């Protein structure tokens, strides 16, 4: 789908409002939220894995966030 390769991060943005800017700002943050609420099992498995792999708490939280963001 073309929808999976949006026109984001292209360095053509001006002060002019872009096409679906207000909509598409949080759509990925709302999508991940809907998914975590629908699939807590993975988020629980993602926490245990992020705890085990990461040594420091920064690594753990970073691995957890990345895992949770890749999964949906």
């Amino acid at each position: 789908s073309v929808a999976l390769v949006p026109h984001v991060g292209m360095g053509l943005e001006t002060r002019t409002e872009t096409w679906m800017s207000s909509e598409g700002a949080w759509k990925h943050a709302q999508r991940i939220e809907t998914w975590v609420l629908r699939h807590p099992g993975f988020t629980i498995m993602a926490a245990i894995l992020a705890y085990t792999i990461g040594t420091t708490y920064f690594q753990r939280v970073l691995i957890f966030i990345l895992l949770t963001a890749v999964a949906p």
Binding site: V2, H7, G9, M10, G11, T18, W19
Partner: protein, 493 residues
């Protein structure tokens, strides 16, 4: 006086020794310039026009399949062949299908099967490219004449429109009564139309990155193609189904118009219906005020009475506008206008509409001024009958220095290193600052290309955290960290 009312209004003060100032004009913004002996000019970039566009490629967004044809082979006999596999009007695919005695085959096993279908685009989107040389920028220059109907007026002929092309990029405008203004613009350095596509879908248009446009996973024709019989990558718009390894069929995928609208998220919409009109982007210009002159500077001051015909009104930038009408004699004359304390001991604020005059007695005059923060008194005319108007300005100078800092930060975010040109007078610190920003803009503009604002926020926090944990390398990464966190908060996508 056209700038008055626009929230993206910028005040540029001071010319260089050469009586010039560098300004950047953004679509939707507007610049008010004023130098010591010069008239105040409003500048708005109101139209970017791209002329003589060439189609780069048509993408197919809605297709229909016709003329489905299948061929089969018995197992161990390799792949079957259809005549349509060499016809570029047909999309084809090979699969395997169980064969045996029940299928008319002497052997048992996977036989090759090929399904083809003729591909017909029903709706397409066109991506056009314009050469940088065919751009035409329109700039309107409105002097602060005080004319009655000129405040925030864009539906009139108060200002002078100049056209700027990469060929005739230096042009002069005779501002009637105000001498001549010269604009030396650089229309090749605002937007790089060699890297851009003017993407037209059904009735809407977008300015999009050229490499992203060529990477679109849709069927496409070269711009020269007139028949529509050689669609490249037709498989992006169809799917072949062999549910139970028994029979292959092909179906056209649905219309991709709404998926393309999603795909166009962080792109800027343009107009490609009445010509290719862009109302986005900027133009960097060198404004030459040498031949500018204040109008009516030989006039004597008015000695009659004035009346307020439109009450003082504050604008979004801390300036006030008032419309007064003259009632005395001696028109044309200079309007006595000051902003003073209550005792009229000190001069507290300045004019934006420098040298306000009365051209005709019965024509009201609009005057913009910048009062200090707090209490101040707008004193108009000379006694007897002198107008004294109380005005209070909320805020403080400290908060104004924060708003000015944020407005400059946001400009560097939008314009990058072009922001160093915005009110430049050609100093060494500006050249050094712009050169460093061009280099950090290259190292940053390559590391963060293709990344969303959330990914910028995350990386900004990660980078900041590494800096807070490891002093030379620590301050450097926290700076990159907090600049990345700012650019993630400021970017639109």
């Amino acid at each position: 006086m056209r700038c008055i009312g626009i929230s993206n209004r910028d005040f540029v003060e001071g010319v260089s020794g050469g009586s010039w100032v560098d300004i950047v004009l953004e679509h939707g913004s507007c610049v008010t310039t004023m130098a010591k002996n010069k008239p105040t000019l409003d500048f708005e970039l109101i139209k970017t026009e791209a002329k003589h566009p060439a189609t780069l490629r048509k993408y197919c967004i809605e297709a229909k399949l016709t003329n489905t044809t299948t061929a089969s082979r018995c197992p161990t006999q390799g792949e079957p062949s259809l005549n349509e596999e060499q016809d570029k009007r047909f999309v084809c695919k090979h699969s395997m299908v169980d064969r045996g005695w029940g299928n008319g085959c002497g052997l048992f096993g996977k036989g090759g099967i090929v399904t083809c279908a003729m591909f017909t685009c029903k709706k397409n989107m066109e991506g056009k490219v314009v050469q940088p040389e065919n751009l035409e920028y329109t700039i309107v220059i409105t002097p602060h004449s005080g004319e009655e109907n000129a405040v925030g007026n864009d539906t009139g002929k108060h200002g002078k429109e100049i056209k700027v092309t990469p060929q005739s990029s230096i042009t002069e405008a005779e501002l009637t009564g105000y001498g001549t203004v010269t604009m030396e613009c650089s229309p090749r350095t605002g937007l790089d139309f060699n890297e851009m596509v003017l993407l037209q879908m059904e009735n809407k248009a977008w300015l999009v990155h050229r490499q992203w446009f060529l990477d679109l996973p849709l069927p496409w024709l070269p711009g020269a193609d007139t028949q529509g019989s050689n669609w490249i990558q037709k498989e992006t718009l169809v799917t072949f189904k062999n549910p139970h390894a028994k029979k292959q069929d092909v179906v056209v995928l649905g219309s991709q118009e709404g998926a393309m609208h999603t795909a166009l998220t962080g792109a800027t919409e343009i107009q490609m219906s009445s010509g290719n009109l862009l109302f986005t982007g900027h133009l960097k210009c060198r404004l030459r005020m040498d031949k500018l002159q204040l109008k009516g500077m030989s006039y004597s001051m008015c000695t009659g009475k004035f009346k307020v015909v439109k009450e003082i009104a504050e604008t979004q930038h801390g300036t006030i506008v008032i419309r007064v009408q003259y009632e005395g004699d001696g028109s044309p004359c200079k309007i006595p206008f000051e902003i003073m304390d209550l005792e009229k001991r000190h001069v507290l604020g300045r004019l934006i509409t420098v040298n306000p005059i009365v051209t005709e007695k019965d024509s009201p005059v609009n005057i913009e001024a910048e009062p200090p923060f707090g209490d101040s008194y707008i004193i108009i005319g000379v006694e007897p009958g002198q107008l004294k108007l109380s005005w209070f300005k909320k805020g403080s100078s400290i908060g104004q220095m924060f708003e000015t800092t944020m407005r400059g930060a946001k400009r560097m975010a939008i314009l990058g290193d072009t922001a160093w040109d915005f009110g430049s007078l050609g100093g060494v610190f500006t050249s050094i600052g712009k050169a460093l920003h061009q280099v950090f803009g290259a190292i940053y503009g390559a590391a963060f290309s293709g990344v969303s604002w959330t990914m910028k926020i995350l990386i900004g926090v990660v980078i900041t955290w590494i800096g807070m944990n490891s002093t030379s390398l620590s301050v450097s990464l926290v700076l990159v960290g907090v600049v990345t966190l700012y650019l993630g908060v400021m970017v639109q996508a």
